[PDB]
Amino acid sequence: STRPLTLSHGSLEHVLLVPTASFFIASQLQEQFNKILPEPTEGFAADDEPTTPAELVGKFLGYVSSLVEPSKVGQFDQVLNLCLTEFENCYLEGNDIHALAAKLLQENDTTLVKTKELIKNYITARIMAKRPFDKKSNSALFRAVGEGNAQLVAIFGGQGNTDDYFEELRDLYQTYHVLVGDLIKFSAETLSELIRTTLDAEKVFTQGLNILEWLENPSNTPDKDYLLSIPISCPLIGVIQLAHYVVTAKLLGFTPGELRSYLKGATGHSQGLVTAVAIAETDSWESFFVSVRKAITVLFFIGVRCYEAYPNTSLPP
Amino acid sequence: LCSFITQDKMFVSNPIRKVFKPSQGMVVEISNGNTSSKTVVTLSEPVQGELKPTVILKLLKENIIQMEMIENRTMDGKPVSLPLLYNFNPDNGFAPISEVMEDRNQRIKEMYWKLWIDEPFNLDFDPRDVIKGKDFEITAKEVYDFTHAVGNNCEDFVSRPDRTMLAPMDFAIVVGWRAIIKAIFPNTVDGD
Amino acid sequence: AVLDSYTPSTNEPYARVSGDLNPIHVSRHFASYANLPGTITHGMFSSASVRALIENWAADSVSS
Amino acid sequence: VLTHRNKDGTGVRVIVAGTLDINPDDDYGFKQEIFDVTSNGLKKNPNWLEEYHPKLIKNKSGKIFVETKFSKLIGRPPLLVPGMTPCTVSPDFVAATTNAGYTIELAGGGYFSAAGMTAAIDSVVSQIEKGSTFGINLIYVNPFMLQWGIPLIKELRSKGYPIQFLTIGAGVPSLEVASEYIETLGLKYLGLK
């Protein structure tokens, strides 16, 4: 039933065995994809260019994914699910995309930016191919903690670890959109409410708190100076932490609480204490969201009220 | 449609035409359009978020067009209005509409008075007489509002523990505005 | 020093604190009737806005 | 096309059936019209008798007007005392004639500086009724008058003067010179001779 098809860039091939009622639509995609590929150059060493066969498959893998919906049935659902299995079976030795990215960094042609690409592609692809991340994974850590030769403690960070904190929220939203989109949107909305709900909160958010907007159009994102002042930076940092918890939980095949169970305990530094408390109150996904609400609605008030208490004033130049 | 208005033999560009010039957000509602003498076109624009009447165009007794020019942001929330009056006259096909000039400055002054001055409308001052203002206590919050309005983040104006709040020299204008502006109002200083 | 300044998005904020409810600055139909380029920023705002710059950079933020 | 130029003004519209080309004038039509679906395929040439038929029409005060393209714009009888030097120089006569409800052109020929004509234009205005208007006749072959005049006219309109048309005698300005008058001066219409 199998009928060869090559995914091509520069001196990099990946031969792709294709089913019968398929090689039609498959070739169509192959062609369209070939068009978008930037011209090869000096070991494909540009920024758009795939470094390796693996990266290329991820590329095409992501291109096909761009043309599908989970809600309605598509005509590429056939091809996508097939390139998935061949990428998985061929390039992932069963481990996580993350393990591959590391290999591709260490051994092959190092690009953090390209690594992130590859990861965006695989997770994104898989989730839009109606093919979720529910089956406990063989995390050697979590396996060994589970047995008894290891124990976990969740530590949560505070304010002031980074100049560009909001950046971490971007990379999260942008990369793992298929996993975190919910609570980003959920938070963006629930924070919006806190501001109506609250008396003079509006005055503190001089340039508004449209988190969803700033994410979509970087162009519209306010200064680091605005983003860093607590009333908006406290809640946002927490969302970042919650968001990270979730990619770890979801990607392990665990519920929020299932993840929490592997923990000997948790603790935060400064404002990170809040999420640790709220994280341990966590059980099932349906219930996960009130836990989020609690956390960020605390942070919001810490931020808004502590700013009001002692607000930054001009430094004598 | 008449491109020009009249003011004492002088020809101005048509103000009605001007004020109704299109633009996203404005909405015109003509009511009773088919009978001439009763027609009332009404312009409503977005004012502080919600829509509201800004202009009201109709006829009055004895062939007098009236353009009710409405300001919604006032001292007490109760909208104020400037009555602009125009003589319509079908015997001059070329310049039918001319403006009623007698007392035009006075009407404009009266509306500005209601917006600036918390006193009775009396335009009978001697320009040479001293104008007394009002006493004025500087609230801690009038300062917060002003500094934040102009964007002055000086620590001398921000409430800090164990320091009295200072007011910006700029704040002088907030205090004297009513005493000062009154000075351009008397009848002997007739201005538009 | 050479400093970068900006006029406000709307004029209502300055009008409220100052008591200058002049429609020229707030209502487009009045601005347009007077034949202005738009809803002109309060000349007084620029006065206090620029002054703030002088205050900060020339007086080292010593209001006094 | 031969028959077309025979008929021109009579509402007949010739179409050349055998050539798909383009007429810069729309004088007539080519192969396309015979087949077009849009209202673009139904063109008709003008009948001057009908198109430009004089008419009558009534004021509300019930005055009667000879309605033509001209009077339809100006709102008075389609008759005018053209600028004339000795005759139309006098602010008195341009007032009187304009007060009698007729369009008259104030003669530039008799004025020699912005200041001297400003004198008359202001006299004319003093005698003319409220909301009334007149015009100014300037000579092309006199570059001096044309130099203090065009400005005086523009400076005057800007102040809102009731002088709402310019006529130019002795020659027709060039496209850039004319365009200047049209857009620069605040005039209701321009008169060419």
What does this structure look like?
This is part of a larger assembly, with four copies of chain A. Chain A is mainly α. Chain A has helices at residues 23-36, 53-65, 77-91, 97-106, 112-128, 140-147, 165-175, 177-197, 201-204, 211-216, 224-228, 230-252, 256-261, 272-280, 285-309; strands spanning 6-9, 12-15, 152-156, 263-268. Chain A has a domain at 1-137: Glutathione S-transferase Yfyf (Class Pi), Chain A, domain 2, CATH 1.20.1050.120. Chain A is built from 15 helices and four strands. In chain A, strand 1 (6-9) and strand 2 (12-15) form a beta hairpin. The longest helix of chain A has 25 residues, at 285-309. The relative contact order of chain A is 0.09. Chain B binds chain C through residues 15, 18-19, 21, 23, 43, 45, 47-48, 54-55, 69, 71-75, 112, 115-116, 142, 145-146, 148-157, 166, 168-170, 173-174, 177-178, and chain C through 12-23, 26-30, 32-33, 35, 44-45, 47-49, 51-52, 55-56, 61-64. The PDB classes it as transferase. Keywords: transferase, phosphorylation, phosphopantetheine, fatty acid synthase, multifunctional enzyme, oxidoreductase, lipid synthesis, FAS, NAD, NADP, lyase, cerulenin, hydrolase, fatty acid biosynthesis. Structure of the cerulenin-inhibited fungal fatty acid synthase type I multienzyme complex.
